[PDB]
């Protein structure tokens, strides 16, 4: 997956505009509800899957930080995520779940931007989350 220069600029602008932890928490709640099987390794949540629930807020903080590291250097994401990728395999995460979160994240972006989230913007966001999913899946052996 490769992002064009204008696509990189679009994603950098979005990260400057949205509340990092909160939009990620909303995306997480959405993935847990729409695709229930993604809650497999989250029994510690005790059935509390709302964006404002403490457990979801804590995981959202972890995910948003990593997303920021990806956005700070979009050209070396795979290199920078090698250890994080290996860690996910150790934890036991199914790589398909990464693609599902990308889909719920795009719905949250749509709810935030509404009409300004036109086809071009949508395509840029889709590609970014594909790059992230690919980087996170690369160190699985």
């Amino acid at each position: 997956v490769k992002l064009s220069e204008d696509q990189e600029h679009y994603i950098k602008g979005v990260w400057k505009d949205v509340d990092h932890k909160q939009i990620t928490a909303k995306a997480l709640e959405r993935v847990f509800v729409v695709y229930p099987w993604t809650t497999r390794l989250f029994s510690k949540l005790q059935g509390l899957f709302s964006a404002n629930d403490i457990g979801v807020q804590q995981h959202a903080d972890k995910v948003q930080r990593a997303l920021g590291e990806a956005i700070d250097d979009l050209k070396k994401v795979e290199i920078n995520f090698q250890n994080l990728s290996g860690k996910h395999q150790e934890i036991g995460v199914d790589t398909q779940n990464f693609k599902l979160l990308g889909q719920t994240f795009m719905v949250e972006l749509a709810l935030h931007y509404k009409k300004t989230f036109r086809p071009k913007e949508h395509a840029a966001a889709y590609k970014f989350f594909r790059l992230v999913a690919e980087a996170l899946s690369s160190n699985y052996h």
Partner: protein, 141 residues
Amino acid sequence: VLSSQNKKAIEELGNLIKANAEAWGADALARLFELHPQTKTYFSKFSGFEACNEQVKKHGKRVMNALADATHHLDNLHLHLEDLARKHGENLLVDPHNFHLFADCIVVTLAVNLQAFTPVTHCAVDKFLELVAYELSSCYR
């Protein structure tokens, strides 16, 4: 399966789809063409692929009207979509993989246009679109 709660959610949505068939249809198709360029190959007669384009608008309305009608046949979905399933699987030969791609774009069109789109509603819609995709893929072989 679609629960009694899901069906009511879907029926209410069908009414909104019918009312906004052309605009929502054009938007959903524009997203499909932008994120997945290979889908443009099935519409070689088109003079453009933007939501603004008249041919995109006409096909979008037809697709959305067919989707709205289906929301009133939730108890008998297989028999209701049989004719469309035959058309796609025997004459059009659209690769079945595209039905799922389109579903993910339609969800974003709804998120951009609906006043509210909570995870629960999103789940009901996704289940409906999954059934429609399955039925439309039933007569390929």
